[PDB]
Design a protein around this ligand. Structure first.
Ligand code: HEM
Ligand code: HEM
Ligand code: NIZ
Ligand code: NIZ
Ligand code: NIZ
Ligand code: CL
Ligand code: CL
Ligand code: NA
Ligand code: NA
Lengths: 713, 713
């Protein structure tokens, strides 16, 4: 059945903005997962999960009688898809249970893992999400095998359809680099936003780069991909060695025995996949990755045996029973237990990527320190495991339950507590009047608040105006933020703040974060008055100001907008067309298509463009809040053509005279081209729509200003 | 970016159920188009449209100084995509403005026509939908040129995204038949549900079948396709001859001069397409279809000159300037005006398909009658044009405005007015108890109401329980409806009805349509009580009973369910898998995925399966409303395998003993296989879900009962 995507495969896709509707959600519109979770008997769940660890099912028998390694890998993979570039992936939406991730080759046989959890899921129902359950199970596996975790927070609400994520352009699972859709160019440069080396892998290839078994070169891929997942060297070594303290790999026969992944399997498979024709197809005969490695002498118990083995033997290249490259300890005795036969023992073995921890010189130093100081290793792995499994949860205010660690961690972009009375409505009116009396313009006020608030992304719930980080490095220096203009606005706002705060009694004060937002609100109010309209913009105080020392500058870099269509900004020339980048940004902001449309048309007339560019400024009353953008864009009296100098800039001329009336970018003109966007533009550019435009703009502005306000949830 | 559809291109697509969310709609949740339209000054709109007809724009100059022909074609094409097989297509949602229809080759240059109407649309805003305006414009065109229309109803609310419609499997526009995705098999049998001969055409090819200029053979295609759009021979001849009384075709140079369709065009084209490099690219130089025919001596005025020409000349095969086959009048004088040069005249010309109206023997009889009796022609055309343009509007209760025809037409499936007081809540409780005391079972009551209500389809708003057509031919004899069982239930309910109506005073009575629905309600209440749960199912009276004489039996044939997964029914063996047909039925019913899931699992346990099949009846308390379907389907203690006898029937055995527990079809087991459906099944199969399951089942039951109740809007 031929679809619009088949006919016009390069047209923009707006359905990514209308996922996660109330239509596909089985829960009622008022369901609130946090409230459900807070009444869950978490201790009861943990007891059931402990019991499960050794309750082997015949359809997927437990290695060593204990499912803890399988479950650790399950949780690691749930979290392991995360990319710092866009915040997409990670454990926080339980997406491992949907396509494509439920069928990625690196997630083979995790379908078995999730099915073993169904009885617990069923028993507790809506009070524990899948997303929370996958991580809790990994924690219980660790605790059951003798490792004390750093903590756990609930609050990951389940989702109900697959997320629209760019995982790459390859059309073959696991394709090696340098193909027609290669994710690598130049000197092994991985394309942003990807954080895995091959399609369907989590980070790297366990046999080495493109399957070449060189631990030193593997190390380079490990370092690059783990950095793209927010992990530094210490955290990376801790996580790999910690993980591989447990369990084993599965490669008992040739891979050709393994059948269809879950999304390809027959209906009778009931949601499972990778059925194997090799012997019994399971247990001792299991095939997952094709490798056949067991790292430690006690795979079901926390030990220091990983680094004893890594450093205590020399390693020889060998092949598993499926033909994959792996390593075996030279001259060693058979000390590693077998998973099923108490009469068999094995020599120590390692993956290429485990050997990276010894043969990359930076990792070796860390590995050696962990080998000599196992308490340091345990602590580092506990912290890293917490970070891994919570990286996408957002502000600490979202963290639920009795096991939430009290320690504030720098990676959480922490916001200080508020310990003083907040400004009330009379105070807000007094501060808005002061801001308008200062001489700051509508353009300056709107631009500044936009800059502050629009760093939010719902993928990992980082960013937003809380914290006033726009005043800190590195946000204050970002090109999109107009550093010189920004500094002049912030100086004026800090002077208003100081004067207000110095007049108060009783401990009342206003944060700069709140004042930035409030000042933006006053700009929008002033713009509405400029257009003849009496409008009140909602404001909620309670933001606090974070310090520079609470703001990791390197972690903040990935929130820099290199493309922000809402300010007609593109930092460089990219291969993805700018209107696709606009839709991607709207998706991070949580905006629907109508919201994206009204927001952009209003920002253009308020003067929010970077550098005061006239591109898309289709009005003769800039700084007045009108629907002019739409009325003019849709005027058939104007003809548009790309310029000679630049095919991405367009000139709009009077059709009868040839006279130039406007210029615009692709982001501007897509609203007049795309057949669904133009239908939305037409609503706002109709003669009956001015009041609707204003009230919808105010709503979407307020939505953006509050995106990170989980303190008010 | 590789997507799930790329990896698993045969997986079922649930997004067709989650279109039209409040996310994509720019109007507020409380917007009601009928309320807006009812205050529109329709007379004023029509005056503006009359003026537009002769106000040429230079970017697409008006033929003969009058846009009326263009607008009639535009309205015909808006309505012309309709297919009776599924009710999809038609003018009722304004879909011509979205992909793919906005870029179909048969819709070339209607982009121009729609752009000409933006100033009117913009002036009247939300009070007139695009969908209504396209039709209204065609009627104003006709009236402006001296044709008296049969009337007009508003009420087509605008939609905001493309509908998911199967338009064929070809991958090339206009592909001729007999390719690898041919829509024809056997002796020119067009595949259901299609109603056009080539991808991107409305009905037929104007040169003749696959381009062969044989009017007799073309007639066959005309007849078959028009019948698939609900038009008989008289209506067909009236429409084609009526339409081709006006305007002209456009084929002034070779087609290779015409560029990209709108969805493919550059951003600068601002939603227009087919830009032509031939001479001026417009007006006298226009190329649309590649044919160059003008039918009448007065292309801007109603006449009977089409038939005077068709019958008054003999016709010679010729080629247009673009190379297309067309016909010209032998020996004729130059009597047809030129569209732009008042000093040029032309010979009469015809399409192959016009000549069909004379050379097909059945058409010739009708055409000759219309030629001798142009008043008969005018009346048939007016009636046919109203039917064409209103065919998908639904019940007459949806028809809005001051020009609705008072005549009730048989094709409307009319419902008599109610002229008596309705039963109240106490009466409804008395009737439910009488029904339960009769001895009718939960299964009989649920199955009968299901059968009556589930003929609704939201594509053209036909069907539903209003009318009590289930008691009439042909519904009473449809296999899915279990004719002997149904007859028994209807007899019992008619005796209840007689006894209740005969005891009343004051004219109060209950219709059989209402009592069928109410009885189903009593069944669902009784099932809930069987499960230990007291619930009240909502009921709204006011349906009426239609007569056999008010029921077109042949038109009702297309509403027969040949596949109804909700009753585990498949009338024959089809190429599309049964799970895909389920989702298609759910889309017709207007159900979301959650709604489809609850509804099916509840129907299975209430005994709604046709023939009392055990397939999917995963309960030991049939006729009790419980979640047992979900809990049993999802039990990993059961293993499923296709049977030897039938690969589409599955046996569920205990995994440890081999004992047979259940049997199921693909429709049952898809809820345990598909990863999004299984996620829904898990919510209703959880230990906390009994209350939710009952509540949600009652809500979707009541939704289905009320689908055709536009009298309550
Ligand atoms: C360079 C990064 C890594 C690579 C290439 C890698 C590779 C693999 C492979 C190939 C398997 C075997 C799959 C099978 O055949 O069953 C595996 C198993 C496992 N991995 Fe990793 N791993 C990485 C990092 C991690 C990390 C960060 C964790 C967790 C903290 C982890 C925990 C596990 C555990 C517990 C198993 C055993 C599974 C079982 O017992 O069933 N791994 N790893
Ligand atoms: C067998 C069915 C039909 C065929 C094959 C057909 C074919 C065509 C073609 C090839 C054109 C020229 C497109 C262009 O080059 O501009 C056209 C024009 C037109 N058709 Fe039809 N048509 C059919 C039925 C109808 C019907 C049912 C109506 C309306 C009741 C209609 C009304 C018109 C009008 C008004 C025009 C002239 C447009 C103008 O002046 O711009 N047609 N037809
Ligand atoms: N822990 N990571 C894995 O299990 C894995 C990585 C690459 N191919 C298969 C599995
Ligand atoms: N693909 N996932 C995200 O982009 C996301 C999820 C939730 N809200 C904003 C963005
Ligand atoms: N009235 N129908 C048309 O305009 C048409 C039919 C087939 N190809 C192009 C245009
Ligand atoms: Cl995601
Ligand atoms: Cl449709
Ligand atoms: Na994420
Ligand atoms: Na329809």
């Amino acid at each position: 059945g031929t679809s619009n995507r088949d006919w016009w495969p390069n047209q923009l896709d707006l359905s990514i903005l209308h996922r996660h509707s109330s239509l596909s959600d089985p829960m009622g519109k008022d369901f609130n997962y946090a409230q459900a979770f807070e009444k869950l008997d978490l201790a009861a769940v943990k007891r059931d999960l402990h019991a499960l660890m050794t309750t082997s099912q015949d359809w997927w028998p437990a290695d060593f009688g204990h499912y803890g390694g399988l479950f650790i890998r399950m949780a690691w993979h749930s979290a392991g898809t995360y990319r710092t570039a866009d915040g997409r992936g990670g454990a926080g939406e339980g997406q491992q249970r949907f396509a494509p991730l439920n069928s990625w080759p690196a997630n083979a046989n995790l379908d078995k893992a999730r099915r073993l959890l169904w009885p617990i899921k069923q028993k507790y129902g809506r009070a524990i999400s899948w997303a929370d359950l996958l991580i809790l199970t990994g924690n219980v596996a660790l605790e059951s095998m003798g490792f004390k975790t750093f903590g756990f927070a609930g609050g990951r609400a389940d989702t109900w359809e697959p997320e629209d994520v760019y995982w790459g352009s390859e059309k073959i699972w696991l394709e090696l680099s340098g193909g027609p859709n290669s994710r690598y160019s130049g000197d092994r440069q991985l394309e942003n936003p990807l954080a895995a080396v091959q399609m369907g892998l989590i980070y790297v290839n366990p046999e080495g780069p493109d399957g070449n078994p060189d631990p030193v070169a593997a190390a380079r891929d490990i370092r690059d991909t783990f950095a793209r997942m927010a992990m530094n060297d210490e955290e990376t070594v801790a996580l790999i060695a910690g993980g591989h303290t447990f369990g084993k790999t599965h490669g008992a026969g040739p891979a050709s025995n393994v059948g269809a992944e879950p999304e390809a399997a027959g209906i009778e498979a009931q949601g499972l996949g990778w059925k194997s024709a090799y012997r019994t197809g399971k247990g001792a005969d299991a095939i997952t990755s094709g490798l056949e490695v067991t790292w430690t002498t006690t795979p079901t118990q926390w030990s220091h045996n990983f680094f004893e083995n890594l450093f205590g033997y020399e390693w020889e290249l060998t092949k598993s029973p499926a033909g994959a490259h792996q390593w075996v300890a030279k001259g060693a005795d058979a000390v590693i237990p077998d998973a099923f036969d108490p009469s068999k023992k094995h020599r120590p073995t390692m993956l290429t990527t485990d050997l990276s921890l010894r043969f990359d010189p930076a990792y070796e130093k860390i590995s050696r320190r962990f080998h000599e100081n196992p308490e340091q290793f345990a602590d580092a792995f506990a912290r890293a495991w917490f970070k891994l499994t919570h990286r996408d949860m957002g502000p600490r205010a979202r963290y639920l339950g009795p096991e939430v660690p009290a320690e504030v961690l720098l990676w959480q972009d922490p916001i200080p507590a508020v310990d003083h009375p907040l400004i009330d409505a009379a105070d807000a009116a007094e501060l808005k009047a002061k801001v308008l009396a200062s001489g700051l313009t509508v353009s300056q006020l709107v631009s500044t608040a936009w800059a502050a608030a629009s760093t939010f992304r719902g993928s990992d719930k980082r960013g937003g105006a809380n914290g006033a980080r726009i005043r800190l490095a590195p946000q204050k220096d970002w090109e999109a933020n107009q550093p010189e203009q920004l500094a002049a606005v912030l100086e004026t706002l800090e002077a208003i703040r100081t004067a207000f705060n110095g007049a108060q009694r009783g401990g009342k004060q206003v944060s700069l974060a709140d004042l930035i937002v409030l000042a933006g609100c006053a700009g929008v109010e002033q713009a509405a008055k400029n257009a003849g309209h009496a409008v009140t913009v909602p404001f909620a105080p309670g933001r606090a100001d974070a310090s520079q020392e609470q703001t990791d500058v390197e972690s903040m870099a990935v929130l820099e907008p290199v493309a922000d269509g809402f300010r007609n900004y593109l930092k460089g020339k990219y291969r993805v067309p700018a209107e696709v980048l606009l839709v991607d940004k709207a998706q991070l902001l949580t905006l629907s298509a109508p919201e994206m449309t009204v927001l952009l048309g209003g920002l253009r007339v308020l003067g929010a463009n970077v550098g005061q560019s006239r591109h898309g400024v289709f009005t003769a009353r800039e700084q007045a809040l009108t629907n002019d953008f739409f009325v003019n864009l849709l005027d058939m009296g104007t003809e548009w053509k790309p310029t000679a100098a630049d095919a991405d800039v367009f000139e709009g001329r009077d059709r009868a005279t040839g006279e130039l009336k406007w210029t615009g970018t692709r982001v501007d003109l897509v609203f007049g081209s795309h057949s669904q966007l133009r239908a939305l533009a037409e609503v706002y550019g109709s003669a009956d729509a001015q009041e609707k435009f204003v009230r919808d703009f105010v709503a979407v502005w307020n939505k953006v200003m509050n995106l990170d306000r989980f303190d008010l949830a």
